[PDB]
Design a protein around this ligand. Structure first.
Ligand SMILES: [Ca+2]
Ligand SMILES: [Ca+2]
Lengths: 374, 91, 97
C-alpha cells in the first residue's frame, strides 16, 4: 500500500502515503516512517487536534500559531501531526511548513508535516488508488467548502490513510492516539552509548465535544496537551474553567451549553461533563497558550513538557530530551528554574552529550550552566 | 566641502566602484584601436544570426520570493522584539 | 433603579480620565455589549473608534471573542480607515477577517 503522489496544481509537490487499517500495529507504521521513508527519529512531535470545524481561526491568531509552531520546530527535527486534508488550520500549517522548507538553507534538520486522514474523507481517492511504483499517482488540488470530503493537502509530505473500521466509525482518532502513544514510548539513540525519549505534545484549537474521548485517552496516556486561549470552542471552556480555578457539574454544563447550543442530550452532555471533569482533574498535563500574554510558543511548549516530566518521574535520564529542546531554544532560564532545581539530581556523565551539543551549537549560557551543575 | 564628502567617503567610493565595474562589464574585451575587431565581430554576429538582470524559472522564482518573505518576517520579528525590550517601552 | 441598571452609567473624572473620547467610547461600547452581540450593531461604535484612533479600545472590547465579525461587515470601515489614514485600524481589520 506504499505509494507516491504527484500533486498537480500551483507547485509540483511529491507525497508518500500508506493505507492502514484500524487494527494495524503502530510499531509497523513507525518502522515504515523511519526506515522505509528515511524520516529520522524526531526530537519533538506536535499533534494538531481540532481546527476542522466551520468556525475558523482569526487571521492574526492563525498566522501567529502557524508561525510560532514552525519557528519552534525549525531548531530541531520535528514532526507536526495533522489531519492531512486541505481545510482549516491544517492547510495553513502545511503552507507554513512548506514556506519554511523553501526558505531553509539547512536540510540537516527538517520539519515534517505528516498527515493522518480518513480514507472516507479524501476527494478522488480512486485517482490515487493506482500508486504505481514507477509512476506516482497524479492528484489534483481542490479547495472545497466545509462539507464532508476534502483533498489531501499538497504541502504535507507524508500521509497515513486509515480505513474506516466496520465495528466503530472512529478509527482515525484511535489510530492517532495509538501512534502518539507509540512515539512517546520510543527511545532514539543519543550521541554515543545513550538514548533519549521523543517529546510528544498535543495542540488543541477549537475542539468539538466529539474529540473529548480522544483527548481523555491521550491524557490517560500521559501525553501533555497545549490549548489555544482564544481558539473558539472547547478550548475556551477549558481555559475559562482553569481561570475560575474550580470546575463543578453546574458550571461545566452551563459553559458546554452556552458555547455549543446544538448539543442537547442528557446522557451525551453528562458524558461530556464527566470527560471534561476528569481532563481538568489531571491538570498537570494541560497548559494554556495565550498569544496576548505568552506570545512565545517555544517557552510554553518547554514548560508543558517539563511539567509533564516532573509529574512523571525525577530521574535525570527522562529530562534529557527536554534539556535538548531547552538548549536548542536558548531557554536557559527555564532550564535553571525547572530542570536543574533541587528536585532532579544531575550527574557529570548525564550531561556529557548535552555539553557537547551546547558547545558545538554555540550556547555559552548552557555551557556555563552545565559547568555549574557538575 | 572636503569634510562633507569625507564623512561619506565609503558610500561615495562604493557607488563609484559599482558604476565603473558595470561600465567595464558591458564593454567589448578589446581596447581601442583594436576595438574595431570587436565591433566588426558584433556586427557580423548580428547580421548572420547575463551576470546581472537574469530571468529565473518559475519554481526557483517562487522559492526565492518565499525565502525573501521569510527573511522579511524574521527581520520584522527581530525589530519588534528589540522594540519590546527597549527602555522606553519597559518604562 | 438608576444604579440598579448600572451598565448604562459611566463616570468621567477629569483628574483620572482626562480624555473624554475614551470614556464616551467605553460607555457606548458597554451599552452596545449589554444590548446585543451582533456585529451590525457595533458599526457606529467602530466608526467612532476609527475616527478617534482608539485602536486599543476596539481591540479589547469590539473585536473580542464575544462579537463575531465577518469580512463583509468590515468593508465600509476598512475603506474609512484606509481613506482617513488609520494604519492601526487597517491592520486590525486585516487581523480580524
Ligand atoms: Ca522526557
Ligand atoms: Ca450601536
Amino acid at each position: 500500500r506504499l505509494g507516491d503522489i504527484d500533486f498537480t496544481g500551483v507547485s509540483r509537490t511529491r507525497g508518500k502515503f500508506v493505507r492502514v487499517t484500524s487494527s494495524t500495529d503502530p510499531a509497523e507504521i513507525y518502522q515504515i516512517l523511519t526506515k522505509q521513508w528515511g524520516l529520522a527519529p524526531p526530537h519533538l512531535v506536535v499533534a494538531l487536534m481540532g481546527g476542522d470545524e466551520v468556525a475558523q481561526l482569526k487571521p492574526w491568531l492563525r498566522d501567529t500559531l502557524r508561525k510560532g509552531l514552525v519557528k519552534a520546530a525549525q531548531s530541531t527535527g520535528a514532526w507536526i501531526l495533522t489531519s492531512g486534508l486541505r481545510f482549516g488550520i491544517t492547510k495553513n500549517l502545511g503552507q507554513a511548513v512548506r514556506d519554511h522548507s523553501l526558505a531553509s538553507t539547512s536540510p540537516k534538520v527538517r520539519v515534517v508535516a505528516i498527515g493522518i486522514a480518513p480514507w472516507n474523507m479524501i476527494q478522488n481517492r480512486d485517482l490515487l488508488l493506482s500508486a504505481k511504483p514507477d509512476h506516482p499517482a497524479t492528484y489534483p488540488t481542490e479547495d472545497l467548502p466545509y462539507g464532508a470530503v476534502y483533498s489531501l493537502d499538497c504541502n504535507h509530505s507524508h500521509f497515513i490513510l486509515v480505513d474506516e473500521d466496520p465495528k466503530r466509525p472512529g478509527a482515525t482518532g484511535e489510530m492517532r492516539v495509538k501512534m502518539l502513544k507509540h512515539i512517546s514510548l520510543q527511545r532514539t539513540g543519543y550521541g554515543g552509548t545513550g538514548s533519549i525519549e521523543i517529546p510528544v505534545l498535543c495542540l488543541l484549537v477549537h475542539g468539538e465535544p466529539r474529540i473529548l474521548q480522544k483527548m481523555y485517552k491521550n491524557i490517560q496516556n500521559s501525553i501533555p496537551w497545549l490549548i489555544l486561549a482564544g481558539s473558539g470552542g472547547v478550548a475556551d471552556i477549558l481555559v475559562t474553567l482553569m481561570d475560575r480555578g474550580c470546575w463543578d457539574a453546574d458550571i461545566v454544563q452551563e459553559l458546554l451549553i452556552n458555547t455549543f447550543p446544538d448539543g442537547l442530550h442528557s446522557t451525551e452532555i453528562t458524558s461530556w461533563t464527566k470527560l471534561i471533569q476528569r481532563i481538568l482533574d489531571h491538570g498537570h498535563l494541560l497548559t494554556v497558550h495565550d498569544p496576548e500574554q505568552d506570545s512565545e510558543l517555544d517557552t510554553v511548549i518547554l514548560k508543558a513538557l517539563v511539567k509533564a516530566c516532573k509529574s512523571q518521574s525525577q530521574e535525570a535520564q527522562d529530562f534529557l530530551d527536554e534539556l535538548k529542546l531547552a538548549v536548542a531554544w536558548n531557554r536557559v532560564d527555564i532550564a535553571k528554574s525547572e530542570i536543574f532545581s533541587g528536585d532532579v539530581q544531575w550527574s557529570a556523565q548525564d550531561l556529557e552529550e548535552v555539553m557537547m551539543e551546547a558547545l558545538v551549537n554555540d550556547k555559552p549560557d548552557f555551557v556555563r550552566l552545565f559547568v555549574d551543575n557538575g | 566641502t572636503f569634510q562633507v564628502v569625507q564623512e561619506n567617503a565609503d558610500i561615495f567610493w562604493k557607488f563609484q566602484r559599482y558604476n565603473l565595474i558595470v561600465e567595464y562589464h558591458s564593454r567589448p574585451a578589446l581596447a581601442p584601436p583594436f576595438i574595431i575587431i570587436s565591433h566588426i565581430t558584433q556586427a557580423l554576429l548580428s547580421f548572420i544570426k547575463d551576470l546581472l538582470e537574469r530571468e529565473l524559472p518559475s519554481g526557483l522564482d517562487q522559492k526565492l520570493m518565499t525565502w525573501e518573505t521569510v527573511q522579511k518576517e524574521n527581520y520584522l520579528a527581530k525589530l519588534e522584539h528589540e522594540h519590546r525590550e527597549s527602555s522606553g517601552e519597559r518604562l
